[PDB]
Amino acid sequence: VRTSSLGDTSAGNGANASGGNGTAVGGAASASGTDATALGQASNASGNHSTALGQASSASGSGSTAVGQGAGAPGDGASAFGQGALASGTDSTALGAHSTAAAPNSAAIGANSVASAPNSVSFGSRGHERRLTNVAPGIDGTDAANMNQLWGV
Amino acid sequence: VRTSSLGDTSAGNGANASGGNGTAVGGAASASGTDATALGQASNASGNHSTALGQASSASGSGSTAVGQGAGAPGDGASAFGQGALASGTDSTALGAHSTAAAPNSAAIGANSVASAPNSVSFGSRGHERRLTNVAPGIDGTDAANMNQLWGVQS
Amino acid sequence: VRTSSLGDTSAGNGANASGGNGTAVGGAASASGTDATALGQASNASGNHSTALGQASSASGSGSTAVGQGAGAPGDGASAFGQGALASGTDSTALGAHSTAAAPNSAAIGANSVASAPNSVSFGSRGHERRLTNVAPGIDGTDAANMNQLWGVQS
Ligand SMILES: [Cl-]
Ligand SMILES: [Cl-]
Ligand SMILES: [Cl-]
Ligand SMILES: [Cl-]
Ligand SMILES: [Cl-]
Ligand SMILES: [Cl-]
Ligand SMILES: [Cl-]
Ligand SMILES: [Cl-]
Ligand SMILES: [Cl-]
Ligand SMILES: [Cl-]
Ligand SMILES: [Cl-]
Ligand SMILES: [Cl-]
Ligand SMILES: [Zn+2]
Ligand SMILES: [Zn+2]
Ligand SMILES: [Zn+2]
Ligand SMILES: [Zn+2]
Ligand SMILES: [Zn+2]
Ligand SMILES: [Zn+2]
Ligand SMILES: [Zn+2]
Ligand SMILES: [Zn+2]
Ligand SMILES: [Zn+2]
Ligand SMILES: [Zn+2]
Questions:
Q1: Which residues pair with B59 in a beta bridge?
Q2: Of the four listed, A105, A117, C10, C107, which is most buried by Cβ atoms within 10 Å?
């Protein structure tokens, strides 16, 4: 257990928290961004205010978060949750194992989901679409419409 | 590495797991709730069964989870994922950097999304709506309708 | 802090990382899968490429991730976020406290949400539906229709 006078803490062979208020726990775990936190062997939180939790996880974007083995978040404001998830667009969010949020301000929801269009939320990919269930009827213009509502027309 | 007979583990300058089965790792990391887990400098898992992971992350609600630097989950049953995400409503869920789910039983999906109505899931905020894609056609009454179904009705 | 020549790290009474590139931190924390990461007392990352973070969390599925106190991911490709969240279906994703993504290829979004139909995404459960808000109008056949669009047909 190695500590610094600037709030860094590390543990594991070759683990290095050098950014200030850093935490790096795991073999060759690295937290080089300010306010950065890395957990798992070869985890890498190099972005400022980044968080990389999971073996070979990586969060190199500013304000990025990658959680799950081999998860990646290279976009600024990008967040990836799930083993092998990638959030690579600016302000993107990938939630699901092997999900990919590639476009800016996009989200990909579910395992293997891909978001390749700006400002959109993807629940799968072409030929692998998912039904959205337990949706209460929409009220405002920008609420989703459910089947009971479509049928009422 | 400090350990107690009651399942607590602490590592870091001033790191303190004191709640029973606590784990606190990072400078001034604090796990004071029962079964609490805190990782990162100044991380604070103070709710019973809370989990705060990331620098300055905070999970003070009972059963709360905050993952991401500066993430916060002060609501009971609340879960926040993303840097600066905030799940402040009871049973709220905020998934995306700087997302906010303030209302009870709500969810905010995507960066900067705001959920301020109860029992609702927001995919953005007013003037910043997001489109929902790769949606299979709705089958049951409470499923979403897609554009293909809307077009077949416009006939 | 114990370390192996095969990249394992463990800290805590009875902590054990034995799979290769493993990390196990906390009282009786266990990381037995390859490339596995466990944080918290009794946390258990026994799947290959699994990640279990939170007191008593479990990720026993291959490539599974469980984050939150008592969160569970026994399914292959399963990801659970939130206290007591369970993603048990193959390729399922449970996001929210006490959410359950049970069916293969399903997702449960929101506290207490249940997904029991394959290839579907649930925002609640029967009699506990949630409104989806801040949805831009759909463009492609497989985009969700919003209310403005529905009303544009109604006339
Ligand atoms: Cl940066
Ligand atoms: Cl953007
Ligand atoms: Cl696609
Ligand atoms: Cl202790
Ligand atoms: Cl002891
Ligand atoms: Cl509490
Ligand atoms: Cl910021
Ligand atoms: Cl409510
Ligand atoms: Cl396995
Ligand atoms: Cl894989
Ligand atoms: Cl399926
Ligand atoms: Cl089309
Ligand atoms: Zn800061
Ligand atoms: Zn930020
Ligand atoms: Zn296929
Ligand atoms: Zn307990
Ligand atoms: Zn609970
Ligand atoms: Zn604006
Ligand atoms: Zn591997
Ligand atoms: Zn995988
Ligand atoms: Zn799978
Ligand atoms: Zn009920």
A1: B45
A2: C107
Which residue in chain C has the smallest CA separation from B92?
C111
**Which residue range forms the structural domain that includes residue A19?**
1-153
- Residues of chain A with Cβ-Cβ distance to B11 below 8 Å are 1, 9, 11, 25
Block residue for tokens 């257990």? A1
How many CB atoms lie under 10 A from the CB of residue C104?
18
CA distance B19 to chain C (A): 12
Q: Report yes or no: A3 and A9 within 8 Å, Cβ to Cβ.
A: yes
The two beta strands, B58-59 and C100-101, are: unpaired
Separation between Cα atoms, residue C152 and residue C155, nearest integer Å: 6
User: After which residue numbers is chain B interrupted with C–N beyond 2.5 angstroms?
Assistant: none
CB C134 to CB B128 under 8 A? Answer: yes
Is residue B91 annotated as involved in ligand binding?
yes
The contacts of residue B47 (CB under 8 Å, 6+ apart) are B33, B36, B59, B60, B61, B62, B63, B64, B73, B76
Give the CATH number, domain containing residue B93: 2.150.10.10
Phi-psi map region of C72: left, alpha, beta (phi>0 left; psi -120 to 50 alpha): beta
Q: Do residues B61 and B55 lie in contact, with contact meaning Cβ atoms separated by under 8 Å?
A: no
Count of domains forming chain C: 1
* C146 DSSP β-pair partners: A144
Instruction: Find chain B residues with C-beta within 8 A of C55's C-beta.
Output: 21-23, 35-37, 49, 51
**Among candidate residues C116, A142, A45, the one with its CA nearest the CA of residue B26:** A45
